[PDB]
Every structure is written in structure tokens, then in C-alpha cells.
């Protein structure tokens, strides 16, 4: 029942994300600039941690979080896209490093001037290395149809992403929806678009094996710990616990009872075989 209310996890690479979200380490908001190529064996998340700065949400975000928690950190490799005929310097007032900017890991695509046009550009990336990729893109659902026409020219917009297994299409509906993808090695993604598209710039590659927690306390470097729960660290050799059932790691299993006492000692007769508390009258204190 006694828990250390500090995350003491020395001997392991530990990063404290803080204001940075878990999904943010791929997207790259202003609050995750120092965790873009992080490598750790314990990825701690926070209550105030936000995945994005621009208003929007992911798709299969719980699955992506469960992939990222055991990822062991992500290794960014540039996909090599460069764009001719369109502007790749889109910014917003919501995300501010120094001035009005956008994500560091992905590039917002616009037109040359307002209401002009948008060329049908198609791009591709081939996985050279043997680890699976973690490609993610974005679709910009604009606030108004007039703003959509100003940003990406007049007409309907069609964005499709294809691969060996993944094959889908997206249409904006007039604010940013991020869709990820699991890309097997020696497979070519295809980013065909003619409009709103938060185009990727770097590909995330998984480093190894780790485990992620979701806490609200500080980080220490003193214990040799295996399992951490949402309000501290539980270390013991005991088999059962009572603190929290959502603990992640290698820790005692959760039971409802608060005190299960194993009789390490023997039967006390103070002042089944029938010797103790039997023909023997009472126990002895002088031994």
C-alpha cells in the first residue's frame, strides 16, 4: 500500500515531455522543439501536454499513442520533398516560436498568390532501411469556403494516399486532421493531391523497445524501479497491490483487499495435527 510519490527510474533513459504531448513529437509544435529526435526508455506524459498547437485532432490517436509509447524514441529521416510552383512557407498566429510559424516537421502548402491555382502534384518515398516507417500527413479543413478558395484556388480538392496495403482518399469539408500510416520496408507511398495538404517533410523511424507512463509527479534518479502508476512509483517484491489497477510495467497485480496477511509465523497460544493448541497447554515466551 505504500508508494513512492516520485518517479525514481535511474539506469534508464528518461525524458520528461512536460508541455509537449506524446503525439507532438512527430508533428513538431513549438512546445516539442527539443523532443523531435528523442531517445528514451521511459516517455512520461503530462496533463497539460497538448499534441497540437493549431486546432485539430488525429485519426486513430490512441493506436498512434500505443505505438509511440513502446517505440523507444523516434529517429527522423528527411523524405526529400521539395516543391516547385507552390508556397511552402505557410504560417499561423496560433503557433509561435518567435513569430508566426508552423510545424517544424511538416510543411503547409499554399498557392503562389491568392485565388490563383494549385497544380496537381504527386510525390513518393521509398523506405531504404529495414525498419517500418511512421509516415503521417495532414488534411486542412478550412473554416470557410472563401478561405479555402483564397488558400488553394477555386475548385474541389482531392487528396489520396496509396501504398502496398494502405489506400484511401480524403476531401476537405469547409481544423487540421492528421492521418498516419504504417509503411513496410521497400514500399512506396504516393501523395497525390490538388489542394489542402499538410505535406510531410521528415519520416519517423522507430528506435526499439520501451514503455510509457502517464503521471503527474516529478522525476527522480535514485531507485531501481520497474512499474510506475499515475501517481508515483510502486516497487516491491510482493505479488499483490491495492494502489491502482492501471499501473504499467512489472509490478504487483491489483486486488481489492487492502491487507492480506500471510502467516509466516506459527500458531500463537499466549498465557490440525493436535500438538499446537492441543495436549500442549500454552506457548513459551523465553525461547
Amino acid at each position, epitope marked *: 500500500r505504500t508508494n513512492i510519490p516520485r518517479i525514481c527510474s535511474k539506469g534508464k533513459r528518461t525524458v520528461d515531455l512536460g508541455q509537449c504531448g506524446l503525439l507532438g513529437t512527430i508533428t513538431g509544435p513549438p512546445q516539442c522543439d527539443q523532443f523531435l529526435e528523442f531517445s528514451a526508455d521511459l516517455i512520461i506524459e503530462r496533463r497539460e501536454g497538448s499534441d497540437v498547437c493549431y486546432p485539430g485532432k488525429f485519426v486513430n490517436e490512441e493506436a498512434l499513442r500505443q505505438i509511440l509509447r513502446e517505440s523507444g524514441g523516434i529517429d527522423k*529521416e*528527411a*523524405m*526529400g*520533398f*521539395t*516543391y*516547385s*510552383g507552390i508556397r511552402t512557407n505557410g504560417a499561423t498566429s496560433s503557433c509561435r516560436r518567435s513569430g508566426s510559424s508552423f510545424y517544424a516537421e511538416m510543411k503547409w502548402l499554399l498557392s503562389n498568390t491568392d485565388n490563383a491555382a494549385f*497544380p*496537381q*502534384m*504527386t*510525390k*513518393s*518515398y*521509398k523506405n*531504404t*532501411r529495414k525498419n517500418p516507417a511512421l509516415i503521417v500527413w495532414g488534411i486542412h479543413h478550412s473554416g470557410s469556403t472563401a478561405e479555402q478558395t483564397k488558400l488553394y484556388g477555386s475548385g474541389n480538392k482531392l487528396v489520396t494516399v*496509396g*501504398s*502496398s496495403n494502405y489506400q484511401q482518399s480524403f476531401v476537405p469539408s469547409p481544423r487540421i486532421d492528421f492521418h498516419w500510416l504504417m509503411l513496410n520496408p521497400n*514500399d*512506396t507511398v*504516393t501523395f497525390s493531391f490538388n489542394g489542402a495538404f499538410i505535406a510531410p517533410d521528415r519520416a519517423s523511424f522507430l528506435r526499439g523497445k520501451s514503455m510509457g507512463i502517464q503521471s503527474g509527479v516529478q522525476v527522480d534518479a535514485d531507485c531501481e524501479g520497474d512499474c510506475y502508476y499515475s501517481g508515483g512509483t510502486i516497487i516491491s517484491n510482493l505479488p499483490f497491490q491495492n494502489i491502482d489497477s492501471r499501473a504499467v510495467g512489472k509490478c504487483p497485480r491489483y486486488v481489492k483487499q487492502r491487507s492480506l496477511l500471510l502467516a509466516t509465523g506459527m500458531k500463537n497460544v499466549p498465557e490440525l495435527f493436535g500438538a499446537i493448541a492441543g495436549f500442549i497447554e500454552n506457548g513459551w515466551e523465553g525461547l
Partner: antibody, heavy 119, light 112 residues
């Protein structure tokens, strides 16, 4: 834009090792394939081999075991190094990244250096 | 190795004509999606080639609307609907499907 520019010698003795350079500007070699297009005078373009930023390469089978393309430790410099230079191998060497490996509607070529095999 | 062939060798043009250059292939140049992996290059004399048509039928930036590539499978053809004086030069078609990479023999487009 990723602007490319190549430089190197122009007077090269026969059966001597050739060495060029191609320094990019506007970007750096951290992604994509980098191609070393060959052109003899009056003949067609010949691809001799691309190089990835990691180090993997795919050389030309017709010119195997003659060209050692390597990228410098600095990430804004990659070079060609050809062994056993032939008088029939006199060409106008180019330096480019080609828009067929990836981003399809964008490519950037060099300027075109002159090499000559004479005594 | 994939060999490239194209017809004709030299097609002379008058300023103002509908013109057609066709480049053939010895193997079907279709990747897993990604359209058809052949691109069109255009070389001025004493300069470097720059991309005109990528993936067979898509126009690159800086390319006027007169150029229009088309084709599928192994038959690829470049069409020009209006010939001016700045279209003179050698035409190269490149496959970008599998290693090794080869160019065409070249289409020396002269005048008259």
C-alpha cells in the same frame, strides 16, 4: 531551391584517377538520391549511378568497379572518383538529383564540367 | 537492363505545327501505383536538360501549355500543339522504374 554547382580538373592524363566535386547550395545532403549523369560529346546521356545520403549506392553495370561515388563527412559536399580513365571515356560530366526517385515534378541539374583525356 | 528506343531520329519543325515525339520501352513501366515511371528531358545546345513532362502525362513547372505528354503501358508519346523557335534541341526520354537507368538515343529536333 536546391542549387547545384560542380568543379574539377580539365586536363587529365590517361590511366589516371579522376576526381570531381559538386557542392550544393540552398540545402544539404541529408535525403534523396544524387545522380552523376554522363554525356560524351555528340552522344546520349548515360546514367552511371546514384548515391543515397546514408551511403547506399547502385552503380552502373556497364561501368562496374571503376567509379567510387562517396559523400563527404560535411553534409554539403559529395563527389565522384573514377579509376582507370580512358580516352574513349571523354565526356561532359553533369551533377543532378533527378525527379523520378521521389518528388516527381522537381529536379535540379548542374552546369556541366569539361574533362579531357590527352597527353 | 532496360533499353530505350524512340521514333523518329530527327524530326524537323517549321515555326507553327502540331508535332509528335514518341518514345517506346522494352518493358511496361508501371510502378506500384505512382502512375507510369517515365520522364521527358529537353536539352538546349551547350546547356543542361530540364524537366518538361514527368510521369508520362503531367506538366512540370515552367513548362508552357503547348507541351502535352501522353501514353500508357509501353507506348509513350509527347505532343506539341504549337512550335516556336525555343523548342529546338535534343529530346531524351528516361525510365525511372528499376535499376539500371538508361536514356534514349536522342531526338535531334532541327528546323525547316
Amino acid at each position: 531551391q536546391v542549387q547545384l554547382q560542380e568543379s574539377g580538373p580539365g586536363l587529365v592524363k590517361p590511366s589516371e584517377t579522376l576526381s570531381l566535386t559538386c557542392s550544393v547550395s540552398g540545402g544539404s545532403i541529408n535525403s534523396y538520391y544524387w545522380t552523376w549523369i554522363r554525356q560524351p560529346p555528340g552522344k546520349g546521356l548515360e546514367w552511371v549511378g546514384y548515391i543515397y545520403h546514408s551511403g547506399s549506392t547502385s552503380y552502373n553495370p556497364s561501368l562496374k568497379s571503376r567509379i567510387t561515388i562517396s559523400v563527404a563527412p560535411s553534409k554539403n559536399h559529395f563527389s565522384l572518383e573514377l579509376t582507370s580513365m580512358t580516352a574513349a571515356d571523354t565526356a561532359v560530366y553533369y551533377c543532378a538529383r533527378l525527379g523520378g526517385h521521389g518528388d516527381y515534378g522537381s529536379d535540379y541539374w548542374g552546369q556541366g564540367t569539361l574533362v579531357t583525356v590527352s597527353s | 537492363d532496360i533499353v530505350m528506343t524512340q521514333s523518329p531520329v530527327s524530326l524537323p519543325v517549321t515555326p507553327g505545327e502540331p508535332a509528335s515525339i514518341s518514345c517506346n520501352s522494352s518493358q511496361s513501366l508501371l510502378h506500384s501505383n505512382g502512375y507510369a515511371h517515365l520522364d521527358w528531358y529537353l536539352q538546349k545546345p551547350g546547356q543542361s536538360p530540364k524537366l518538361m513532362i514527368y510521369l508520362g502525362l503531367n506538366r512540370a513547372f515552367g513548362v508552357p501549355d503547348r507541351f502535352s505528354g501522353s501514353g500508357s503501358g509501353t507506348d509513350f508519346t509527347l505532343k506539341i500543339s504549337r512550335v516556336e523557335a525555343e523548342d529546338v534541341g535534343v529530346y531524351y526520354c528516361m525510365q525511372a522504374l528499376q535499376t539500371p537507368f538508361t536514356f534514349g538515343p536522342g531526338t535531334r529536333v532541327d528546323i525547316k
